[PDB]
Amino acid sequence: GSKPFSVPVLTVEEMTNSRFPIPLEKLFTGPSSAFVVQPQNGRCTTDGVLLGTTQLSPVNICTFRGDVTHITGSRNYTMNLASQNWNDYDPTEEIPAPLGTPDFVGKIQGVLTQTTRTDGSTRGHKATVYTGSADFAPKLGRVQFETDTDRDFEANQNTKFTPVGVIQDGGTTHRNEPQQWVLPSYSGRNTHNVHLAPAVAPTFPGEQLLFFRSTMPGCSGYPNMDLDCLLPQEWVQYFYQEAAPAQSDVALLRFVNPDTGRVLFECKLHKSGYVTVAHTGQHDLVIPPNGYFRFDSWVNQFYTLAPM
Amino acid sequence: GSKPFSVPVLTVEEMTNSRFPIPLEKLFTGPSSAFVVQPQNGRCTTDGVLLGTTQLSPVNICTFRGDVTHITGSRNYTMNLASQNWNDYDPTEEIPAPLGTPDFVGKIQGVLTQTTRTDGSTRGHKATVYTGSADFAPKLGRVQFETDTDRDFEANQNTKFTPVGVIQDGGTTHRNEPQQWVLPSYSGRNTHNVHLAPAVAPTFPGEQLLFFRSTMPGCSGYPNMDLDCLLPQEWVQYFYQEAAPAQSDVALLRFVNPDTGRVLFECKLHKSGYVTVAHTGQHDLVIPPNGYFRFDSWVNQFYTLAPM
Ligand SMILES: C[C@@H]1O[C@@H](O[C@H]2[C@H](O[C@H]3[C@H](O)[C@@H](O)[C@@H](O)O[C@@H]3CO)O[C@H](CO)[C@H](O)[C@@H]2O)[C@@H](O)[C@H](O)[C@@H]1O
Ligand SMILES: C[C@@H]1O[C@@H](O[C@H]2[C@H](O[C@H]3[C@H](O)[C@@H](O)[C@@H](O)O[C@@H]3CO)O[C@H](CO)[C@H](O)[C@@H]2O)[C@@H](O)[C@H](O)[C@@H]1O
Predict the structure, then answer these.
(1) Given CB atoms, is B234 within the 8 Å cutoff of chain A?
(2) Nearest CA to ligand 1 atom 26
(3) Among A195, A215, A240, B86, fewest CB within 10 Å belongs to which?
(4) Interatomic CA distance for residues B142 and B163, integer angstroms
(5) Pairing relationship of beta strands A226-229 and A262-270 according to DSSP bridges
(6) Where are the alpha helices (DSSP H) in chain A?
(7) Which of B287, B292, B303 lies closest to B29 in space, CA to CA?
(8) Whose CA is nearest to atom 10 of ligand 1?
(9) Are B268 and B251 contacting, i.e. CB atoms less than 8 angstroms apart?
C-alpha cells in the first residue's frame, strides 16, 4: 500500500513549459514517427528521478552564466561557463550538459548582462546563441554569443544570458528553424552526447504522444515557434517532491472539466515520464480553461484508452 | 487532527524569487523599521490563499502582454494590456493590478517581442518600463515602454514584454534605484492602490524579517540589484497545492544542515505568509548549500526563538 501517486491540480494555463521559461498554452497531439522525440529538459520519472539535463526551476531553462572573452575583430564573445550559483563549472557530472542547457537546435536571442564587482557598474546587450553552431559546446564549458557590441563587455566578470525567444534568418525557409526535436551536440560538432534521457515514442496501436505546448516568442524572421514538452515543469517539480512509487508502468489520468463534472479525455502517464492518448492525426485539444488532470489508477502498458 | 502542514524539501539555490523571474541566492535578515515592507508578489497564506498580485508560475512575474500604440515622434510605445492568455483584460477583478505586475518602483529593462498573425513574421526590440512613471497604470490596462525603434512595431498585434533586469540612470545616486519597497501606483500617478496584501513587520522584541534574496541582473548604470521576497515562489506553489489548515498563527521551522545533522537556525513562518528570526542587525546568512527548511510545530505568536 505505497504512498499514493497523484498529479497536481493545476490547469494547463497555470503551468509552465519545461523546455523554455514560458507558460504553457495548450495541449497538442500528433504523429511522431517522422522524428526522434528525445528532449533533455522536462524529463522526470513519476517517482521523482530527474533525467537528462532537467532541473527544478523554470526560470533557469536556457540561461547561461560565466565569464566572456571577446573574439577580437567581431561582435562575438565566447562564454566560459560557470555553475548556476557562479561556482566553477564541474564537467564531470554524469549529465549531457549543464542542467537547463537548451535541448534543441535553434538561434536563441536574449540579453547578456554583466556586473563589474569593484564598483557595481552594469551593462546589458542583445545576444544570440546558435545551438547548432560547431562551437556550441556547453558540456565542455564553452558557448559563443553574437552581440551588438565589440567593446562594452569586460573579461573576468560575472555575465549572464537571459533567454527571450528565437529567430529565423540566414536563408532558411520560413518556419524551418528552430528544430525543436534536433538535439545539440553538447560537446561540439562531431562529438557524441552522453548520459541522455532516452527517446520516447508511442508503442500501442492507435496511440500518439500528448504534448504540452507553448509558443516561443519570435524576435526576428519567420521562426517555428512551437515548443512541445513531455511534462509541465510543475509536474517535474511535483514528482521530485512527492517521490511516490509507481505501482505499474502506466498511470491512467483523466482530464476533468469542472464546468460539467465530466471527463473530457483520458491518457497514459508512463512511469518514465511522458504521456500518450488514443488519437490518429494532428489535433489541437479544445479544453475548458479550468480543466485539470487527475490520477485515477495504475494500469498496464497494454490498457486500451478511450479514443479522443 | 488536520492535514499536516509542511514546507517543501528544497534548498535555497533550488528555489526561485517570487518578485522577479530569477533563482534565489541567499538568505538575509536586517531591520525594516525604516521602510514599509508591502510587496504584492510572493504573497500567500500558509493554507494556500494567494494574496496581492501573486500568481503561480515564476516565469510570468514582471511580464506584460497586449497591443502597442506608437507615440508618434518618439521611440516610446503604449501597451494596452491583454490577459496573460491573450484574452481581453478584465480590470474588475478585486486585485491591485494584473497578477504578476511588478511590485516595486524601478526601471525594468527587457525585450518587447511581436508576431504578425497573417504571416508569422516576428520582431524583437530592447525596451524599458519605468514603474514609477506617472503613466504606469497596469490596473487601468496601460503601461509605457521606451524602445530602440520608432517604426518596427505594428499596431493591433500580440506583443510581449520579457523582463531581464534593471537599470540606474537619469542622475540618480549610485544604487539609489530601483527602490524595491516602494509600491507603484498601479492606476497611475495620484491614484490609490486597492486590494493590497498588507504590510508586514516583526512585532516580537528582538525579531527581524527573514528575506529570500536574489540579485537582479543589471543592464546599465549602478542599480541596487538586491531583491528580497517574503516567500520563495516554490512555497507559494506548495501552499496553494497543499492547502493545509494552520493550527496556530505561527509555524516553527528549523533550517537543517544535512552535512552535520544539526539545526543551523529556527524561524517563525507566520500563517499570513512571512518569516521572522531572532536577530538584531544586517546579516547575510552563511548556509550549507544543501540545507533546507523543515516544519516542526505550530506555536503561538509569542514563542521565543533561539537567537541566530
Ligand atoms: C520578418 C521580419 O523580421 C525582422 O526583419 C528581419 C528581416 O526580415 C525580412 C525577411 O528576411 C524578408 O523575407 C522580407 O520579406 O522582409 C523582412 C523584413 O521586413 O530579415 C533580416 C535578414 O535578412 C533581419 O533578420 C531582420 O531582423 C523584423 O524586424 C521585421 O519587422 C519582420 O518581422
Ligand atoms: C555604469 C556604466 O553603465 C553603462 O553605461 C551607461 C553610462 O554610465 C556612465 C555613468 O553614467 C558615469 O557615471 C560614468 O562614470 O561612466 C559610465 C559609462 O562608463 O551612463 C549612460 C547615461 O549617462 C548610459 O546609461 C550608459 O548605458 C554601461 O554600458 C557601462 O559599461 C558601465 O557599466
Answers:
(1) yes
(2) A220
(3) B86
(4) 17
(5) unpaired
(6) 233-242
(7) B287
(8) A221
(9) yes
Residues A211, A163 contacting (CB under 8 angstroms): no
Question: Do residue A121 and residue B14 have CB atoms under 8 angstroms apart?
Answer: no
Positions of E strands within chain A: 26-30, 64-70, 76-81, 107-115, 122-130, 142-147, 159-167, 207-215, 218-221, 226-229, 250-257, 262-270, 274-278, 283-284, 292-299
**What's the rounded Cα separation, in Å, for the pair B199 and B214?**
21
Domains of chain B: 1-60+174-308 (2.40.510.10), 61-173 (2.40.30.120)
The resolution of the experimental structure, rounded to one decimal in Å, is 1.5
Q: Does A289 touch chain B (CB under 8 A)?
A: yes
CB of A118 shorter than 6 A to ligand 2: no
- CA-nearest residue for atom 30, ligand 1, is B123
Is-contact A95 A83, C-beta < 8 A? no
- Inspect the interface and report whether the beta carbons of B57 and A14 lie closer than 8 Å: yes
Distance B166 CA to ligand 2 centre (A): 13
Q: For ligand 2, pick from B126, B128, B168, B169 the residue to mutate: most ligand atoms within 8 Å of CB.
A: B169
The number of the ligand 1 atom at minimal distance from the alpha carbon of B154 is 31
Q: Tell whether B232 lies on the interface with A, counting CB pairs under 8 A.
A: no
Residue listed under C-alpha cell 565542455 = A140
Ligand 1 atom nearest to CA at B119:
1
B6 contacts chain A (CB < 8 A): no
Instruction: Give the chain B residue nearest A222 (alpha carbons).
Output: B121
Determination approach: X-ray
Length of chain B: 308
CA pair distance B287, A269, nearest whole angstrom = 38
CB contact under 8 A, B164 and A13: no
State how far the Cα of B85 lies from the Cα of B1, in Å rounded to an integer: 40
Could A124 and B165 be called an inter-chain contact, meaning their C-beta atoms sit closer than 8 Å? Answer: yes
Three-state SS string over chain B comes to: CCCCCCCCCCCHHHCECCCCCCECCEEEEECCCCCCECCCCCCECCCCCECCCCCCCHHHCCCEEEEEEECCCCCEEEEEEECCCCCECCCCCCCCCCCCCCCCECEEEEEEEEECCCCCCEEEEEEEEECCCCCCEHHHCEEEEEECCCCCCCCCCCEEEEEEEEECCCCCCCCCCCECCCCCCCCCCCCCCCCCCCCECCCCCCEEEEEEEEECCEEEECCCCEEEECCCHHHHHHHHHHCCCCCCCEEEEEEEECCCCEEEEEEEEECCCEEEEECCCCEECCCCCCCEEEEEEEECCCCCCCCC
**Measured between alpha carbons, how far is residue B94 from residues B97, B138, B185, B197 in Å?**
9, 14, 16, 12
* Start-to-end CA span in chain B (Å): 32
* B213 close to B226: Cβ distance less than 8 angstroms: yes
